Amino acid sequence: EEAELELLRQFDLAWQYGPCTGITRLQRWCRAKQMGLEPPPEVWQVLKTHPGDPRFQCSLWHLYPL
Amino acid sequence: MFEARLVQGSILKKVLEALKDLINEACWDISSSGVNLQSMDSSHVSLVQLTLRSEGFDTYRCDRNLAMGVNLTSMSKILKCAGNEDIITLRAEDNADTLALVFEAPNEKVSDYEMKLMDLDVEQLGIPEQEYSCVVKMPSGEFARICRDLSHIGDAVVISCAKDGVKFSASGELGNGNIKLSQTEEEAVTIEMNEPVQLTFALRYLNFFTKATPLSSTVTLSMSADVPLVVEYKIADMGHLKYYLAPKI
Amino acid sequence: MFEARLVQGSILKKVLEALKDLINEACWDISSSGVNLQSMDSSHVSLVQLTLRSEGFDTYRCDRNLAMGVNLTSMSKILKCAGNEDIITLRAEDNADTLALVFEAPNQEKVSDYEMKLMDLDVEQLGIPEQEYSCVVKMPSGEFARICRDLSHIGDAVVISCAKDGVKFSASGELGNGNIKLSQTSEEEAVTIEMNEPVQLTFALRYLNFFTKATPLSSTVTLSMSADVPLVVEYKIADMGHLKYYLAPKI
Amino acid sequence: VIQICSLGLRWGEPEPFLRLALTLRPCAPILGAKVQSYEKEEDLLQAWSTFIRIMDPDVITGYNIQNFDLPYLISRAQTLKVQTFPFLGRVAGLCSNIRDSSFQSKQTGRRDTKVVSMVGRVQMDMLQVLLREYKLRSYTLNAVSFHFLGEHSIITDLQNGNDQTRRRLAVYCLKDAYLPLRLLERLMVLVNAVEMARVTGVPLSYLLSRGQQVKVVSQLLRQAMHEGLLMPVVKSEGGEDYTGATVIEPLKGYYDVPIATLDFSSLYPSIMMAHNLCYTTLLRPGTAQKLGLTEDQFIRTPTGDEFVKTSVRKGLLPQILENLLSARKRAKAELAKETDPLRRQVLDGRQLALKVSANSVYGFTGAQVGKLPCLEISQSVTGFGRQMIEKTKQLVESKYTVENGYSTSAKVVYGDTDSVMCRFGVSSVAEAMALGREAADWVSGHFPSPIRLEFEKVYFPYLLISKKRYAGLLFSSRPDAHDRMDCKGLEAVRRDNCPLVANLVTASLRRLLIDRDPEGAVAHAQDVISDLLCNRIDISQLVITKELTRAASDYAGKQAHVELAERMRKRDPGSAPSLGDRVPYVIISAAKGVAAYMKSEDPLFVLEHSLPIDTQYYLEQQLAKPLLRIFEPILGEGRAEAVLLRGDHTRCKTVLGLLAFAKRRNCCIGCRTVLSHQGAVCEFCQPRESELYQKEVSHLNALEERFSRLWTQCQRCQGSLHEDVICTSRDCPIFYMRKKVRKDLEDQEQLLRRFGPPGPEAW
DNA sequence: TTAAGCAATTCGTAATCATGGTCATAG
DNA sequence: CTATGACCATGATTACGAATTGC
Ligand SMILES: Cc1cn([C@H]2C[C@H](O)[C@@H](COP(=O)(O)OP(=O)(O)OP(=O)(O)O)O2)c(=O)[nH]c1=O
Ligand code: SF4
Ligand SMILES: [Zn+2]
């Protein structure tokens, strides 16, 4: 923790995985894996050792009335 | 077609003066089980729940489940054109949006009014039944004076239910004070306790809740952990009237 | 440690109801003689002397010559929260600058325990003269209030003529002149105009309305006047002591 | 400070020549601009100071650079210990400093600004130019860019990310830094500033700091050296007021026969010109005596003074006024040959400025707190004004009458201190125009020169409500049929109200004056009130704005906007309204009826926290009384009952801590009876179910069509079709109108799942 | 040391004044 | 157990300041 919260914030702004501020984080991870762009096997291995926490399993701007 | 007839119009006038300040619009759910109502206040803080059971109306007739939309100010103005001894009948169609009220004096004078209803798009809410753990049954006059007397000091009040009795405290810029009450027919204060309670509620809502004091002699206060305080009144072989208010955090 | 009780306690409600419209503050002098209050008015025309002996109380403990100050109208708003049959109890610590009021019930089931904070006071204090009052009148308080209020709807200030046979309450106004005459009546409803030498004086009728705020405060009202001196109206607080309102006269 | 972005041009060339952007992390290249990157902020501030020394610009502009940008840079350079930053000026050994200043007048109000010292260079914040010249509703860059052209915590994670995010941030910053240049060259700011400095004779820094006194002092001194006079110093605190202008009593109502308007042009400067009024020719009451020559040596005014004829002296204020009048005449002669509309109004702005200068010459005389007051002159001016307008009204109503061979005796309906609205009688616009031109040219021949009356318009029809409140339709020629409406004073040009009310007043006067159909007007006002009560009106139409003036007058009595401003937020005690700006608010519903200052809230706070709206406040306090102003004079008091009955058929249709403890009782779609079970239809109203499904799928169909038109408009206003939209612009109707249709669709989609599915889905 | 003028209409808040519903106690 | 006016409570009228626009 506090290092796992920057890896996800770095996965969320890389443009080669998609334009993602409307959906979940694991849905975008599996969308890129289907098309197989290059999802890395570390943004998966922190979404498995946690429960349904809203500060891991949510996009950066999931507040913010946009 | 709906038609009811009730001999004690005074009960109707007391219930309509319970609510004309807290609520401006309501929907009456007319059924074959009685006349039942739920509403929120205008401030979106408190809940009212009113039940007039079907038996206590001394001449009942309801064909089909209705829903009437009533502006409570115009109805409260109409029900003060009827003295305290009259006999009140309600007449409604199942195709119309206009209600008829006929007041029958117990002596040569009969009166009849027609009132236009309105269509409203409100949503109906309710309550689930759980066991509140502090159960107070107290005189209504003492509760009215206690709320009205603490009101001049400050605006919150803390209710403190302990073993032998309950204790109400309130503060403000001109100081603070409490009132005790202890276990010792209707002038008694019966106190059932399993877990002790201490909670805080604002006074403007309580001084709204104590407007319906002529409906009964005693009042029932129910408390539990972190739930909305319930204020309950009973109307004799007619039904009941409940207000609901949430605690401060 | 001051701790005092009063069973027929409606009198305190009654005095502070007739105190708060006059003045905004009071200099409460607690001595071993009891509870006293000398205080001027706000308009520099009048004065209140309240004396409450200890023998008019029930149960008493005074260990200090306390000299405190009360903001009156907030204390009256607190006194509005207790009935008249209810027992009034006061408690005071000579280091803790607060007043602890305890309202007991006659059925003892409702207990009240209120607290008002203190504020400092440097109030002026003058002594009344003692002299001969050429006219002392014993009157019913309700009839007196009725008469001066009946004069309030004519004009503003009253002229009084105090003599042997009758007494003459006259006034002018925007509708003209009027006057009512009284005489002695040959225990509470009895009147008496005890007189040596007849006089004429000017007084303010609005301050008579202010002074008749203590109408339910006694058996009889006493009206004491002489030449060019403060009128003292007296309400004898029954079995307790007395309240005297001084009004410096007009020119 | 993480990014600085700069644009530079030579004046006269239609594009810039320099485009630079300096960032603080490594970035990605932008076509058309240079990009440099640094790993520390000291290098960034040093690089900007060296660039600003080497390019050496004449003028520095921006938007809110005075009160935000330059003191932020100066304080940030002081904190990080960089010694060589604050030398931005032209003199080689001088450092710059922050200094407060205030300005106040009854014309622009009071404003408090900081200044930063730059010797040699000139500053033009475009915000201060807008706030001084223009009277608008919001003064944000988005609002004035829409009005003239047509358009913090997210940025901190666009900068802590990657370098294409930083490239997006730099393109945004460069568009921001480019907009005030376009506004400066499009609005003809600098050309008018240079012409103002050449006509008045004051420097170019005084037209951004001072008022209208230094210019008239300057022109009077420049005219005083040519005859050898010296000015005195009189100062007095304080004289009394004098009597201003007359207004003629109306004949109120609705007119449908044409009224022609005749007015005087440049009234007070021509009074001061053609009766030889000046400081330097004011005759004291004794110095006429004991000479007795009254005739053609002096004159007498209605207030009482005596003033010398022009055969002895020429005043100084006639000559200054004559120069200003010729400059404005040349500006109008240039304006009479433009075809573009925005260019036509900016030349109108130039001539408006020269007329304001000429009238402030007269207003200099009566200012008892000033530098040289002579209230005798002011009283003579307004006395001559009153005398001449009553002369106009007597003459116009007296000559053209039934006995004098004409058709109908005319009757004046209105006059306000420079104009006369005479009602002639004919209902043909050609004959009214002909007689009105004859009347203007006839009456003008009873005066000295340059006093002239002129025809200006014909109103047909006309609507007169009170003093300083009227409306009409505008005719310039006859075969030029009609131009527009005129709304003098009414509820459509003031800014103290809601957009909903001003829009309703404009649409009602449109349907009522152009098409002459009161039934569509009643149906329109009914639909507005019905859609108000049914809770389908956007919150853009509900926002009220008020100006936060000096704090002691707002200490004297409790207001709504002052209460909202002085109540800080928990989020930000560092961004709040200051003195001089505008506070926006809406009114929410509560039960504290003694105070409308206890129900006011920020629009963004009621957005994010979802508080309800007081529809009865907006119904009886905002809407109702302007409508009763407008709709009554065409009919009687059965018209008040007609609109209050058109309310009455439509008032009976209203839409609706403890809120979490819901039960969510279902209800019959046909007859609204709460009942156990989830089926949509009631057992008595079950047969008519195909019609009840038919009804409401044409509502889902129309919500679907509104979702798509809005959420793809943001993609075209943003620029890109492949990346996310981030624009929470509070001055755009687009924002928060795109937020509620998501919830309408969320609700209306779930109401139709009460009905089953129209087929399987797992086959 | 610094600042162009007057006329008029509209709306909100607190304070002043009128009037009825309870009530409290003397008959 | 029942008249009478004194007492509390709620609504109609006036006054004045603030804001903004027309000449
Ligand atoms: C607008 C305005 C008018 N006035 C006075 C002077 C003017 O002579 C008089 C007439 O007002 P305006 O008609 O507004 O101005 P104007 O007549 O001088 O010029 P034009 O007809 O070409 O528009 O009102 C002022 O003193 N100060 C002002 O700001
Ligand atoms: S909300 Fe959409 S349309 Fe409105 S300003 Fe923002 S991007 Fe443009
Ligand atoms: Zn049904």
Side-chain angles (χ1 to χ4, degrees), chain A, chain B residues 1-106 108-249, chain C residues 1-106 109-251, chain D residues 1-662 666-672 675 677-680 682 685-763:
Chain A
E1 192 178 3
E2 294 180 351
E4 286 170 84
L5 263 296
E6 198 70 28
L7 261 291
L8 307 178
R9 205 170 313 123
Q10 282 273 307
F11 171 75
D12 284 358
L13 279 167
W15 86 107
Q16 71 260 47
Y17 301 144
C20 309
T21 77
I23 61 186
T24 322
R25 168 163 298 158
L26 194 142
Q27 282 171 313
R28 162 200 162 115
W29 196 90
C30 292
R31 176 175 76 175
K33 184 66 183 201
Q34 195 262 9
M35 300 177 297
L37 294 160
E38 231 2 298
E42 188 72 29
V43 194
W44 190 72
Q45 271 288 87
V46 311
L47 299 179
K48 191 165 153 273
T49 59
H50 287 128
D53 203 315
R55 72 167 183 200
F56 289 92
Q57 270 83 14
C58 269
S59 174
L60 267 191
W61 309 325
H62 74 112
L63 277 81
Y64 295 100
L66 59 93
Chain B
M1 173 167 284
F2 179 72
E3 176 142 352
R5 184 193 188 121
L6 168 67
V7 305
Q8 292 175 356
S10 51
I11 299 185
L12 210 74
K13 304 163 71 162
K14 294 180 220 155
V15 184
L16 214 58
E17 277 277 9
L19 310 165
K20 72 155 192 165
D21 54 321
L22 192 63
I23 303 167
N24 204 1
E25 300 287 321
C27 289
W28 300 88
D29 174 60
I30 305 295
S31 60
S32 171
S33 159
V35 188
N36 196 355
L37 194 142
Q38 296 91 19
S39 181
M40 293 194 73
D41 58 316
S42 309
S43 298
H44 275 189
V45 193
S46 40
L47 213 70
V48 306
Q49 202 274 329
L50 160 72
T51 303
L52 311 166
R53 304 161 177 197
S54 50
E55 295 92 6
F57 272 94
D58 311 309
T59 297
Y60 200 90
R61 191 185 157 276
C62 164
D63 188 88
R64 178 222 305 168
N65 285 179
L66 256 171
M68 281 189 285
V70 166
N71 167 44
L72 279 181
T73 298
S74 284
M75 198 187 198
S76 293
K77 278 193 65 185
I78 287 174
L79 276 183
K80 300 308 181 297
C81 290
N84 267 18
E85 279 316 295
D86 291 4
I87 302 165
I88 301 193
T89 186
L90 306 154
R91 182 133 70 203
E93 305 285 335
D94 277 328
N95 73 324
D97 59 343
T98 300
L99 186 64
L101 274 74
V102 178
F103 311 123
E104 314 175 353
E108 62 264 8
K109 193 194 159 199
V110 70
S111 67
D112 40 354
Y113 300 98
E114 311 294 321
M115 173 183 36
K116 318 155 185 169
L117 314 172
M118 303 184 162
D119 43 350
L120 324 174
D121 291 88
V122 310
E123 180 52 283
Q124 295 179 356
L125 277 79
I127 217 67
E129 315 301 314
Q130 56 191 347
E131 316 308 307
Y132 319 112
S133 190
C134 275
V135 178
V136 191
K137 186 193 61 60
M138 76 155 65
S140 42
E142 306 277 343
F143 192 69
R145 305 292 85 71
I146 276 160
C147 280
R148 190 161 82 107
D149 279 346
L150 299 171
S151 70
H152 332 117
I153 314 299
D155 58 74
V157 163
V158 50
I159 318 297
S160 303
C161 203
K163 177 64 188 68
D164 63 323
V166 199
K167 187 178 80 71
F168 310 133
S169 311
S171 90
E173 66 86 18
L174 69 161
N176 53 4
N178 82 15
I179 292 95
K180 284 173 186 179
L181 219 49
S182 82
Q183 266 199 355
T184 56
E185 147 74 16
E186 63 197 350
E187 67 271 42
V189 185
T190 314
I191 299 143
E192 271 292 326
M193 164 190 148
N194 292 347
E195 53 93 25
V197 166
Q198 214 193 28
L199 270 190
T200 67
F201 316 108
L203 271 160
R204 176 48 53 230
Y205 305 139
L206 311 159
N207 296 332
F208 276 154
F209 298 162
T210 63
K211 280 275 176 192
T213 323
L215 268 173
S216 304
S217 162
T218 200
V219 286
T220 307
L221 297 165
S222 293
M223 298 193 291
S224 174
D226 70 51
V227 301
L229 167 67
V230 194
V231 196
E232 195 184 21
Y233 305 181
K234 309 290 182 180
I235 320 171
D237 286 34
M238 271 278 262
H240 62 244
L241 177 49
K242 303 205 208 81
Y243 301 86
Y244 284 93
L245 187 64
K248 290 167 165 177
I249 322 182
Chain C
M1 314 185 161
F2 181 53
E3 191 161 357
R5 186 181 170 86
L6 179 53
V7 181
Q8 180 71 27
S10 66
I11 41 188
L12 180 46
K13 284 190 54 181
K14 274 146 201 185
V15 298
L16 187 51
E17 274 296 329
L19 257 169
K20 55 160 152 187
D21 62 339
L22 328 170
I23 50 173
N24 204 47
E25 76 95 35
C27 170
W28 288 70
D29 299 291
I30 297 182
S31 43
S32 276
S33 170
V35 165
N36 200 274
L37 168 51
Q38 59 271 18
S39 180
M40 264 302 166
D41 71 314
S42 301
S43 184
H44 194 75
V45 206
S46 190
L47 205 162
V48 43
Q49 176 259 1
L50 174 85
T51 186
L52 263 50
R53 298 153 214 167
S54 45
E55 49 263 19
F57 285 120
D58 206 305
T59 310
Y60 197 67
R61 174 149 184 246
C62 195
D63 292 328
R64 180 65 181 89
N65 206 269
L66 271 182
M68 301 170 307
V70 164
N71 217 357
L72 296 176
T73 190
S74 158
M75 185 38 79
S76 87
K77 288 189 81 178
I78 292 153
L79 288 202
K80 274 178 174 178
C81 319
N84 298 269
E85 289 82 343
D86 310 348
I87 299 99
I88 290 193
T89 312
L90 201 150
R91 291 175 308 174
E93 289 82 352
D94 309 319
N95 53 4
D97 289 330
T98 184
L99 317 177
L101 301 91
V102 194
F103 297 130
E104 292 85 1
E109 177 59 45
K110 165 155 183 164
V111 175
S112 296
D113 41 356
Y114 300 120
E115 288 88 27
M116 186 159 140
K117 303 326 157 205
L118 259 287
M119 69 302 297
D120 198 6
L121 295 174
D122 203 358
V123 187
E124 72 281 349
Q125 208 155 284
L126 62 80
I128 204 60
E130 273 308 320
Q131 49 168 351
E132 200 281 302
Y133 289 106
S134 309
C135 35
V136 284
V137 180
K138 195 166 85 58
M139 193 67 219
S141 297
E143 194 59 62
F144 176 50
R146 163 73 190 273
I147 287 306
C148 57
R149 200 174 31 84
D150 276 334
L151 269 296
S152 279
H153 304 84
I154 296 149
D156 187 280
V158 68
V159 51
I160 193 174
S161 172
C162 313
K164 272 310 193 296
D165 305 71
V167 69
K168 273 77 52 173
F169 307 146
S170 198
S172 83
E174 54 276 359
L175 55 92
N177 285 321
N179 38 6
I180 316 174
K181 331 290 170 299
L182 273 300
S183 63
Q184 311 99 5
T185 313
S186 87
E187 80 300 334
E188 194 207 39
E189 272 306 305
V191 308
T192 293
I193 308 108
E194 201 270 312
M195 178 81 47
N196 43 66
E197 191 267 332
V199 289
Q200 54 277 355
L201 282 87
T202 174
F203 282 106
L205 179 63
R206 180 80 265 195
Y207 299 154
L208 313 182
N209 310 347
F210 271 14
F211 277 8
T212 47
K213 293 273 164 290
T215 301
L217 264 298
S218 187
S219 71
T220 75
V221 62
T222 319
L223 276 292
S224 72
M225 274 158 290
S226 179
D228 206 348
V229 285
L231 155 68
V232 195
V233 315
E234 287 87 4
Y235 303 94
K236 271 285 169 172
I237 314 193
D239 192 74
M240 172 75 83
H242 54 257
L243 168 134
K244 284 190 286 215
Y245 284 160
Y246 315 117
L247 173 61
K250 313 306 210 72
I251 202 66
Chain D
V1 178
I2 50 159
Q3 277 193 5
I4 315 170
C5 290
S6 308
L7 260 298
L9 65 95
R10 301 181 193 90
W11 192 73
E13 305 181 18
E15 306 110 317
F17 76 95
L18 203 59
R19 205 179 288 251
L20 172 74
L22 293 150
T23 73
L24 198 146
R25 279 286 287 280
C27 187
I30 306 178
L31 185 65
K34 191 157 164 59
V35 162
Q36 311 169 19
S37 302
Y38 304 98
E39 282 312 278
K40 269 156 66 177
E41 328 184 19
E42 299 91 327
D43 309 338
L44 190 71
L45 291 158
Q46 275 207 10
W48 194 64
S49 68
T50 308
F51 162 70
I52 208 62
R53 162 162 93 246
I54 286 174
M55 177 204 164
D56 201 60
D58 276 29
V59 191
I60 302 185
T61 61
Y63 211 88
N64 206 45
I65 43 163
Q66 295 191 355
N67 283 313
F68 183 63
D69 284 307
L70 295 165
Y72 202 99
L73 291 157
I74 286 181
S75 299
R76 195 46 184 187
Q78 283 179 359
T79 302
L80 288 187
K81 313 144 190 162
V82 194
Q83 60 255 3
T84 315
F85 187 77
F87 293 92
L88 296 314
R90 257 159 176 171
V91 167
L94 207 44
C95 65
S96 277
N97 284 142
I98 309 165
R99 182 218 91 191
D100 305 358
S101 162
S102 68
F103 182 84
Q104 63 157 353
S105 171
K106 296 163 188 178
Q107 219 69 38
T108 81
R110 168 192 184 165
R111 283 173 196 92
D112 182 59
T113 310
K114 311 142 94 165
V115 298
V116 174
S117 64
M118 297 293 177
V119 291
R121 318 204 198 275
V122 192
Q123 299 200 35
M124 293 203 60
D125 204 311
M126 278 296 303
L127 192 150
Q128 295 296 111
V129 187
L130 289 189
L131 261 60
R132 283 171 55 245
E133 207 282 334
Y134 285 99
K135 291 194 304 176
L136 312 166
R137 210 169 170 111
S138 159
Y139 284 105
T140 321
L141 188 45
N142 312 110
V144 293
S145 90
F146 186 77
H147 174 56
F148 289 114
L149 313 185
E151 172 187 356
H152 277 165
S153 66
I154 294 169
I155 295 175
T156 313
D157 278 343
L158 280 173
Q159 205 271 337
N160 278 282
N162 291 325
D163 52 357
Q164 263 86 23
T165 48
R166 298 195 271 262
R167 190 194 158 274
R168 188 186 185 178
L169 184 59
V171 177
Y172 180 66
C173 192
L174 266 162
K175 175 57 190 151
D176 269 355
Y178 187 47
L179 190 46
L181 277 172
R182 294 178 62 190
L183 261 185
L184 156 70
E185 56 168 340
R186 200 187 283 245
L187 266 161
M188 284 175 56
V189 176
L190 206 170
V191 176
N192 293 346
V194 170
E195 185 204 316
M196 209 70 228
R198 289 185 189 179
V199 172
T200 56
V202 300
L204 207 59
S205 43
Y206 281 8
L207 301 185
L208 278 150
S209 297
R210 301 261 190 153
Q212 325 275 317
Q213 273 176 2
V214 282
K215 310 157 54 194
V216 63
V217 169
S218 179
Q219 298 167 348
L220 179 79
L221 277 186
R222 291 172 185 272
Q223 295 281 344
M225 193 161 270
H226 303 159
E227 304 201 29
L229 318 163
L230 274 158
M231 78 168 190
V233 188
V234 300
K235 187 69 200 63
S236 43
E237 297 222 339
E240 62 165 320
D241 201 1
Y242 65 111
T243 302
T246 193
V247 190
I248 307 175
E249 275 294 316
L251 311 191
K252 183 195 167 303
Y254 171 91
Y255 280 81
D256 212 352
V257 50
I259 295 101
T261 304
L262 319 176
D263 62 351
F264 298 100
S265 62
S266 310
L267 187 58
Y268 285 176
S270 306
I271 290 169
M272 293 210 57
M273 275 197 223
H275 275 287
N276 197 22
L277 269 60
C278 175
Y279 287 115
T280 317
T281 181
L282 166 62
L283 199 75
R284 90 173 175 91
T287 193
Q289 280 80 53
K290 282 319 190 323
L291 192 64
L293 281 187
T294 60
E295 54 276 1
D296 74 278
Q297 270 98 26
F298 58 86
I299 67 149
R300 284 178 174 88
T301 70
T303 304
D305 304 309
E306 320 96 320
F307 271 76
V308 179
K309 280 277 207 168
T310 189
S311 158
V312 174
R313 295 290 291 269
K314 174 79 74 70
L316 309 193
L317 311 178
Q319 312 203 72
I320 308 172
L321 278 178
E322 203 152 321
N323 165 49
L324 273 164
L325 180 135
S326 182
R328 195 219 183 190
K329 196 160 187 177
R330 278 197 338 261
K332 286 149 83 93
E334 188 264 338
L335 157 64
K337 58 102 178 181
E338 198 81 12
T339 61
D340 222 4
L342 201 147
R343 304 274 89 91
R344 264 173 148 270
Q345 68 94 8
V346 299
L347 316 181
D348 191 1
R350 182 165 158 255
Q351 66 89 10
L352 61 94
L354 293 159
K355 169 206 144 168
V356 157
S357 298
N359 281 334
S360 162
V361 168
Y362 145 82
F364 184 61
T365 288
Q368 299 159 22
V369 174
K371 257 166 72 55
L372 187 55
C374 195
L375 304 162
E376 296 84 296
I377 282 161
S378 312
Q379 292 158 318
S380 279
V381 172
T382 64
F384 271 128
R386 282 190 283 265
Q387 163 174 191
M388 288 185 319
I389 177 175
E390 63 89 20
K391 174 145 200 183
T392 298
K393 184 177 62 211
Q394 276 163 340
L395 263 169
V396 170
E397 263 173 5
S398 48
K399 199 190 189 69
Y400 306 155
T401 194
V402 284
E403 304 97 324
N404 272 39
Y406 307 93
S407 200
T408 65
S409 196
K411 285 291 291 168
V412 177
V413 307
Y414 194 39
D416 186 339
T417 198
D418 68 325
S419 54
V420 157
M421 303 199 175
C422 165
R423 188 200 88 192
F424 271 108
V426 310
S427 190
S428 307
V429 184
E431 322 173 321
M433 275 186 169
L435 285 176
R437 285 199 159 99
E438 174 162 346
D441 301 340
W442 156 255
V443 166
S444 295
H446 273 286
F447 288 110
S449 315
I451 298 174
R452 39 204 181 87
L453 175 75
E454 74 160 57
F455 187 94
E456 266 201 11
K457 42 194 69 67
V458 157
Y459 283 106
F460 176 58
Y462 193 33
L463 184 65
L464 182 57
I465 307 307
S466 43
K467 285 177 180 193
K468 308 205 191 301
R469 298 280 180 105
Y470 59 101
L473 274 172
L474 195 44
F475 285 64
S476 75
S477 316
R478 199 40 181 126
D480 175 22
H482 76 279
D483 294 334
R484 54 183 183 276
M485 265 181 306
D486 265 329
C487 298
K488 293 280 179 64
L490 292 187
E491 310 291 332
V493 301
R494 308 183 46 106
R495 318 193 295 280
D496 43 20
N497 46 45
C498 292
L500 196 158
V501 192
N503 283 169
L504 186 41
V505 166
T506 48
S508 282
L509 270 68
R510 270 174 185 158
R511 299 271 161 190
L512 196 72
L513 292 162
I514 291 172
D515 306 341
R516 298 180 184 178
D517 184 340
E519 286 78 43
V522 171
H524 199 266
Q526 277 191 45
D527 182 272
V528 178
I529 295 169
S530 300
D531 207 40
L532 193 150
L533 299 182
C534 292
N535 284 26
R536 304 179 320 206
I537 298 291
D538 209 38
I539 69 165
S540 279
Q541 304 275 308
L542 302 177
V543 170
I544 306 168
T545 55
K546 272 204 171 188
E547 188 185 9
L548 178 59
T549 61
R550 71 277 191 191
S553 44
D554 306 338
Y555 284 157
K558 294 191 74 65
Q559 313 270 311
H561 54 284
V562 191
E563 190 74 29
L564 175 70
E566 302 301 274
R567 185 195 319 122
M568 297 307 167
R569 291 291 88 195
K570 307 304 138 197
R571 30 144 291 171
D572 198 350
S575 72
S578 279
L579 194 151
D581 50 67
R582 282 196 166 261
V583 190
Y585 64 101
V586 294
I587 289 297
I588 69 186
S589 180
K592 211 281 192 193
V594 197
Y597 55 87
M598 291 295 182
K599 300 141 68 193
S600 83
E601 195 47 85
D602 192 52
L604 212 64
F605 204 77
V606 63
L607 191 140
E608 319 283 359
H609 281 209
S610 315
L611 323 170
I613 310 299
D614 196 356
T615 43
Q616 211 56 52
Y617 175 74
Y618 283 101
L619 182 47
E620 76 196 34
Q621 280 173 261
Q622 312 289 124
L623 280 179
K625 33 183 71 74
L627 291 179
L628 301 169
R629 266 71 169 271
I630 295 174
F631 269 114
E632 287 193 25
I634 302 174
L635 297 91
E637 273 291 328
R639 197 56 169 115
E641 301 305 284
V643 192
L644 293 176
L645 193 74
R646 293 178 179 83
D648 275 330
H649 309 322
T650 56
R651 277 147 185 147
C652 316
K653 322 200 216 157
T654 100
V655 168
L656 177 63
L658 187 74
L659 284 157
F661 285 151
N666 290 114
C667 287
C668 180
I669 296 184
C671 64
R672 302 157 153 157
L675 93 144
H677 95 182
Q678 312 248 337
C682 168
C685 47
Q686 292 177 335
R688 186 200 16 148
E689 191 205 5
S690 177
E691 196 176 359
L692 287 183
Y693 185 86
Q694 244 160 279
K695 263 34 120 151
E696 85 195 3
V697 77
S698 177
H699 184 62
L700 176 78
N701 190 82
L703 262 48
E704 296 261 21
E705 194 274 356
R706 188 202 321 170
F707 186 88
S708 278
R709 282 195 88 199
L710 292 169
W711 267 97
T712 196
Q713 160 67 68
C714 279
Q715 272 184 335
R716 282 170 273 150
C717 166
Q718 175 212 45
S720 177
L721 299 183
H722 299 251
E723 287 176 344
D724 307 305
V725 185
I726 311 159
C727 165
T728 70
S729 160
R730 277 88 63 208
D731 288 79
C732 199
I734 284 302
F735 180 76
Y736 56 66
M737 189 169 172
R738 60 159 155 92
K739 192 187 189 57
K740 65 191 173 63
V741 194
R742 270 189 184 177
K743 294 301 137 282
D744 283 329
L745 210 49
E746 176 69 30
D747 68 46
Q748 185 65 216
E749 191 260 4
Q750 286 266 15
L751 193 150
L752 285 146
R753 303 219 288 102
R754 246 122 109 53
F755 292 89
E761 57 92 20
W763 47 278

